């Protein structure tokens, strides 16, 4: 259409024509569905647009050109590659330092799409030292800019395989710690995602998150009126409790248990699922933390979900109760408590799920219950294992016996031993 003329105008030496042309390119690219990215790329104007972002170029030109490149980078890795190979990244970064506010708003968005393309482009942007100028944007007192920068910042932290350069992304913790206190929902959401990414890693990363005192706030955000905030905050909390017993205790001390208790009755199924997931990693802790969960009255509602929640959630509830049962070896009463709360019936019923990882998890729990029951019997001269009688009455014996027919050897081995040992 105008593209042929637009291309010629863009390469013109007249600046009025360059700007008119750049704006048209920005306009045709501003489409959410099926943007004319390839047509613009093939017009061969990317290097020219990148050229308009140079430091001494007219402001409007830098602005429109960066905006256009921003949307080209919003495409596939192939289309994004064109922008990157044209050396646009280092220019986006410099614009973050010298550009007018409007210009910076384009540049940071562009960096957001580039870093969000893949681990390599994420690393590339980090290698170009984008972190420093980016963290600087949070002192702008500019909402729109901060929102985009928070998002961009999260893409720089995102990715577990490969994990981003920790020595660089860790630099953003102090900033993220303050951002989760923002009243702007949009910024808060992205800050929480960023944090969940940084929290998703080695012991030192979780510890760095704990050291800046982020957990206290994450727990409070679990009750934020929007699930858009609850989801990431809960994710960050969950990732943190995948840490050691000490790190996990910090989260417990920040009062996560009562909060999780409320999440167990959330209207959103994924919230209930992740709340159980989070509890499962706490009951995977030491004796005291398993007891803390017990004292926080999480078992009853956990048992309820185990019996009536959607499968994905039930599986998570199963992990929690099962990890908790592993503590009975050190404290039998934990098993007595679990059984008194009716975990046996739901656990057995779950033996028929189409997930072997869960069958194993359930068989282990039932065995932890069987062992305690056996020890109690041995302890006080009885000849009947009370918990074995409970399992049989719950129809669990028949189900366990059937797991022996599972093609999975591990399942088979577990079921067999349980049957021959307690039944």
């Amino acid at each position: 259409q105008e593209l042929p003329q637009m291309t010629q105008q863009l390469n013109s030496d007249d600046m009025q024509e360059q700007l008119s042309a750049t704006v048209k390119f920005r306009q045709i690219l501003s489409r959410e569905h099926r943007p004319p990215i390839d047509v613009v790329i093939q017009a061969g104007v990317v290097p020219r647009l990148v050229e308009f972002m140079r430091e001494n170029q007219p402001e409007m030109l830098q602005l429109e050109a960066a905006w256009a490149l921003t949307n080209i980078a919003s495409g596939t890795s192939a289309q994004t590659k064109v922008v990157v190979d044209a050396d646009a990244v280092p220019l986006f970064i410099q614009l973050l330092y010298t550009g007018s506010v409007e210009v910076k708003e384009q540049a940071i968005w562009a960096l957001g799409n580039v870093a969000g393309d893949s681990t390599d482009y994420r690393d590339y942007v980090l290698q170009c030292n984008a972190m420093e100028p980016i963290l600087g944007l949070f002192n702008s007192n500019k909402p729109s800019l901060i929102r985009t920068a928070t998002w961009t910042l999260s893409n720089l932290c995102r990715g577990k395989k490969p994990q981003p350069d920790w020595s660089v992304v860790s630099q953003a913790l102090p900033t993220l710690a303050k951002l989760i206190y923002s009243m702007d929902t949009e910024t808060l959401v992205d800050a929480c995602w960023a944090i969940s990414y940084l929290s998703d890693g080695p012991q030192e990363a979780i510890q760095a998150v704990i050291d800046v005192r982020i957990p206290k706030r994450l727990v409070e955000l679990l009750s934020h009126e929007s699930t858009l905030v609850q989801t990431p905050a809960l994710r960050a909390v969950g990732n943190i409790v995948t840490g050691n017993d000490l790190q996990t205790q910090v989260v417990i001390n920040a009062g996560v248990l009562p909060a999780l208790r409320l999440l167990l009755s959330s209207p959103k199924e994924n919230i209930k699922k992740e709340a159980c997931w989070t509890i499962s990693n706490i009951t995977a802790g030491n004796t005291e933390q398993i007891q803390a969960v017990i004292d926080a009255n999480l078992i009853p509602p956990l048992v309820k979900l185990l019996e009536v929640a959607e499968d994905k959630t039930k599986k998570e509830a199963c992990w929690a109760i099962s990890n908790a049962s592993s503590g009975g070896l050190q404290r039998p009463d934990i098993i007595r408590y679990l059984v008194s709360q009716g975990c046996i019936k739901p656990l057995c019923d779950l033996l028929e799920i189409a997930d072997n990882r869960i069958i194993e998890v359930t068989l282990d729990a039932l065995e932890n219950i069987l062992k305690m029951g056996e020890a109690d019997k041995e302890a006080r001269g009885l000849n009947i294992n009370e918990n074995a009688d409970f399992i049989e009455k719950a129809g669990g014996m028949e189900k366990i016996f059937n797991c022996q027919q599972n093609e999975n050897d591990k399942i088979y081995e577990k079921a067999y031993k349980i049957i021959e040992t307690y039944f």
Binding site: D200, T242, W277, N281
Partner: peptide, 5 residues
Amino acid sequence: KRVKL
């Protein structure tokens, strides 16, 4: 302890 993918 189970981590995300």
